[PDB]
């Protein structure tokens with residue numbers, strides 16, 4: 001019926017029309033970490049070489065560690081290693097660790113093979129704990145933690161069969177795994193995306209950021225291989241910071257805005273949108289305050305400030321939508337209310 | 350933008366929302382109606398075109414030529430109505446589609462009496478004229494390249510759609526070298542990528558590095574592929590690109606391959622090409638430092654029709670760069686005949 005590798009159909013949903021064909025399709029998609037023995041050996045070596053724990057790149061890696069925890073600890077127990085892997089909650093932003101899990105090239109002896117084992121006995125706890133995120137910087141600082149250690153294999157990831165085959169890197173790097181990245185353009189609309197970011201861009205006088213949905217705040221570097229228009233861009237003209245996995249792209253820009261370093265990156269989940277916060281208004285006045293830490297539309301008392309301003313940004317105003325409320329861009333300050341009364345972002349990319 | 354897709358290779362099916370770049374290669378000549386401005390405005394633009402020295406048109410794409418062809422009758426009729434002894438003659442597409450240094454002017458004073466819509470029929474065709482406004486078709490002799498308009502039209506905001514085959518266009522306000530970004534679709538997922546439009550289908554992949562996998566060109570246009578619709582547009586010299594920048598090649602690392610540089614002298618006279626990394630049938634290429642130097646792309650067959658069996662290259666890589674056209678299989682510039690004297694071979698007599 002067809003001699004191609006991929007076939008897809010777009011739906012026009014009222015016409016009853018339906019266009020099929022072949023090509024490349026980027027959907028809004030917003031675990032086998034090596035052989036068990038090899039991973040276990042990597043963790044043993046990790047402790048034995050100073051690395052106390054892990055800072056996950058994404059909300060994937062964390063979930064994986066969580067789903068591997070039992071078998072990993074059991075195998076560590078089998079081969080005489082008093083060490084317990086503890087997997088905690090994801091903390092935003094997902095900070096960059098200087099370490100990475102070493103390839104042992106000498107996998108632990110008496111584990112088995114596959115990753116889907118059950119009905120076994122859980123291992124015992126230990127004073128020695130291999131930490132994985134979850135509010136534990138006090139007992140294990142960032143700078144002794146592995147980060148971005150895993151790479152998806154060649155055909156390791158797919159959406160139709162939800163297996164994800166991973167390996168421990170041979171090299172250290174800052175690049176986000178390009179296996180799960182999908183970027184596309186069509187006429188005056190475009191998108192950069194992965195499993196966490198959904199970043200839309202449009203064409204209105206200039207190419208620019210339309211809106212973005214972040215489900216995580218990672219700090220890896222979005223590869224240019226999977227980025228559009230990567231030349232002639234001052235890093236400070238971006239919206240989503242480079243150090244926040246923002247694509248080095250002209251698509252990642254907006255007239256009258258600079259890099260949102262001090263955005264509300266402590267949030268679980270943000271929706272960067274160009275719309276006034278509910279009940280608020282914004283004026284473009286050169287008498288407004290200078291750009292500073294992103295402020296929330298509501299005070300700690302939940303009091304909603306009405307009038308805001310910006311020195312020379314453009315409308316509609318940049319804003320972040322989190323569960324705790326609505327934040328404004330760095331350029332946008334309260335017009336009348338003194339900044340000292342408002343909730344500010346205590347974080348920096 | 351809602352859809353479903355199946356990947357046989359990894360055996361999987363998926364639905365959802367997102368962005369979908371299809372192989373829409375060949376501006377499906379059987380089916381689009383074109384609306385190049387209002388009839389009167391276009392007519393005025395052509396009148397002014399002659400009256401300002403521009404004798405004719407060099408089309409950017411096969412689509413523009415087809416459009417002109419489908420507009421011809423009504424255009425000439427309207428020119429006739431308003432007392433303008435001028436006949437638009439549309440000829441065949443010639444490759445490469447050469448870049449004309451000029452473009453149709455916006456009159457901002459549309460011709461007075463013509464009609465308003467573009468779909469009229471049952472009318473009397475206009476009479477011919479000594480004055481001819483040429484559109485491609487072997488006419489450089491009676492009108493040289495450098496007196497022709499080129500890349501004059503822009504697709505409107507929501508002017509192009511694949512679902513309703515209407516195409517709404519306007520005459521440009523400014524001259525430019527950029528390919529119309531309206532019909533351009535570019536995408537990456539995992540280790541596979543594509544840069545495409547209604548003329549090009551350029552596949553790149555990820556082996557050790559990113560590289561050109563294979564390309565399919567139903568036309569040889571000479572506009573400039575915009576960086577806005579291109580991936581990885583930094584850290585590449587114009588000479589790194591396999592498909593020449595002046596041959597609408599994307600400024601991209603995706604448009605590269607180890608052991609090969611710009612195919613300026615590729616077989617760009619062809620009506621159609623499949624750039625493939627695979628030996629020409631009945632030939633073998635040897636990486637030899639004793640080989641000849643880069644020159645015009647040679648066809649794997651003599652003009653008489655015989656296969657040259659042995660080829661070589663100074664420092665290129667295998668499989669060899671080749672171009673598949675209806676008239677045979679050409680090699681990349683880096684690849685030369687191992688023994689046969691280049692005198693009796695067929696060479697590309699064209700340059701991007």
Ligand SMILES: *[C@@H]1O[C@H](CO)[C@@H](O)[C@H](O)[C@H]1NC(C)=O
Nearest residue numbers: 203204205274314315316506
């Ligand atoms: C986008 O362009 C339209 C004109 O077509 C304009 O009305 C609109 O305000 C622009 N978008 C923004 C956010 O200004």
Ligand SMILES: *[C@@H]1O[C@H](CO)[C@@H](O)[C@H](O)[C@H]1NC(C)=O
Nearest residue numbers: 154555556557558626667668
């Ligand atoms: C790179 O491509 C060659 C053929 O062009 C293939 O044989 C090889 O396996 C590829 N590299 C890898 C790492 O698979």
